[PDB]
TrEMBL record, chain B:
This is NrtR DNA-binding winged helix domain-containing protein. Keywords: ATP-binding, Nucleotide-binding. GO terms for molecular function: ATP binding. ATP binds at Q44, R71, R146, E172, R197. NAD(+) binds at R41, T42, R71, R146, E168, E172, D194, R197.
């Protein structure tokens, strides 16, 4: 009334949404990949992005400290998600590698650990996925291709880097508690909000990192054997690696060097440590 | 508390006349961008609506880059913080006399193109970068380490993947127009708001992807020669390829197959036409 026009040059309407910083801090203990959690393993360390926070990273470092009091080293940004409660909440995830001084990855993602063959839980997951892919005929062919590429429903090799794609398919198929399907079906331990979605991106990032350049000095002690180096990468990838081919990748990437002490002990080169100190949190990558 | 305004920013890249070009608005002054709104189902779907409304140019797959936050002062006037979310997309450039203009990557980042040798502008950049590094002795040593690692002075040479880290250093040093330094110093064509920071992220992403697995079928025509593919990667990297190592890489990765047809080059010699084999197209499709 009294001319309240639609758009107005002297009026700017700004949309706001909740900004949540979420932390995926990973450590390797007893050849088991383990993630920092709060609320008795139901949530990741998280907190809102506030005015007093100088940066996103420094803001998350305060929440990690207040909620865990566990020191963290370098951080790298993962993925940014809109809520699926696309409305009110924007979540920003970060990955960190530390030495444990905690819950396991495969408590939340038991189907991702193939170190001792395929997990038998995958038979039930595939059975539910085939029923969902066959539920609507016009989308049957595409859903079978997605389920084959991710889980290998009608065959197809297992790709460990597709942790996120596998969790997104289970969510769309209503096979995880976070989807909240009418008959609730769930595999693995669920988490608060979409924290398992965040964790999936951290597992995918680490696995993609260790396949072409395993810069994991923060996960190891200062000295280690090459077989200890293989055991922890095998724990991260959820696969058993070939000895000969793993030795070639490490020497090819000039990552480690002999310390002279005794199997031979190795340490990551100082150049690898110095480059990481200057690379920041927005690393040049190929996927994320 | 914990609110933020999200701007979705698009880096849509095409390769025309062996030159990498980015889609822009306002006659090359800004990238296509728009706020994230409540009705936007996802961050990617929200940006697609801004791309269409502002350019009306078709866009294929989109890949999230990184999220940046503001360092402003009176964000409390806005009700929350301000963040920027970038996305990278590869398309074929299309003329249509909508309003949108295609500009080359290196109009904004001239120091990133080393195809014709190291550019001369880097001599003026390194000079002003040293003067900034020597201005404050307590931080001189650390600033020289950042200047050596980012701008090729390291000894390891020029790293084309560090496009964002180079630009961020130039911003902190007050060597770009977006810094608004007390004496204005700028290299390359500036952009609106922080969009040149977003473009540097997309350039770094593409260069890291093509180094490991150049899945660039969206940038190429349906069929192409191997020389056309090499010129495309070279334009993206700002470097000249090792021909034999590049041919060996795309064969090991099983990326392109012969179409059976022939093409006559400019000089007059015929050459086999290639296409990205279907398995490469299907893998990129089975995601998001
Ligand atoms: N708008 C901007 N455009 C370009 N560079 C910027 C901008 N704002 C800050 N920078 C620079 O970017 C660098 C990184 O700061 P930023 O606020 O992005 O987060 P950060 O946690 O310090 O990053 P990192 O530790 O990953 O380098 C700093 O050198 C800063 O001066
Ligand atoms: K919040
Ligand atoms: K950051
Ligand atoms: K502020
Ligand atoms: Na740069």
């Amino acid at each position: 009334y009294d001319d309240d026009d639609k758009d107005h040059p002297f009026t700017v309407t700004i949309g706001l949404a909740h900004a949540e910083l979420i932390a995926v801090v990973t450590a390797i203990t007893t050849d088991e990949p383990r993630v920092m959690t709060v609320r008795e393993g139901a949530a990741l360390p998280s907190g809102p992005f506030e005015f007093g926070h100088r940066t996103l990273q420094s803001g998350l470092r305060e929440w990690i400290h207040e909620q865990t009091h566990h020191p963290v080293g370098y951080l790298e940004q993962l993925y940014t998600f809109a809520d699926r409660d696309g409305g009110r909440t924007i979540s920003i995830g970060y990955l960190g590698l530390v030495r444990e001084q905690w819950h396991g990855w495969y408590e939340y993602f038991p189907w991702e650990d193939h170190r001792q063959g395929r997990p038998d839980i995958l038979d039930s997951i595939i059975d539910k996925l085939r029923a969902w892919a066959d539920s609507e005929p016009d989308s049957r062919a595409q859903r079978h291709l997605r389920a084959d590429f991710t889980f290998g429903l009608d065959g197809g090799g297992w790709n460990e880097e597709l942790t996120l794609q596998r969790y997104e398919l289970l969510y769309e198929a209503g096979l995880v508690g976070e989807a909240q399907s009418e008959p609730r079906i769930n595999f693995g331990r669920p988490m608060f909000a979409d924290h398992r979605r965040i964790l999936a991106t951290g597992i995918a990032r680490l696995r993609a990192k260790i396949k072409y350049r395993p810069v994991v000095f923060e996960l190891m002690a200062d000295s280690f054997t090459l077989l200890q180096l293989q055991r922890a990468i095998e724990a991260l990838a959820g696969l058993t690696l070939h000895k000969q081919n793993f030795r070639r990748l490490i020497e090819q990437q000039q990552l480690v060097e002999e310390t002279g002490d005794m199997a031979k002990l190795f340490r990551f080169r100082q150049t690898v440590l110095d480059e990481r100190a200057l690379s920041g949190t927005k690393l040049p990558l190929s996927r994320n």
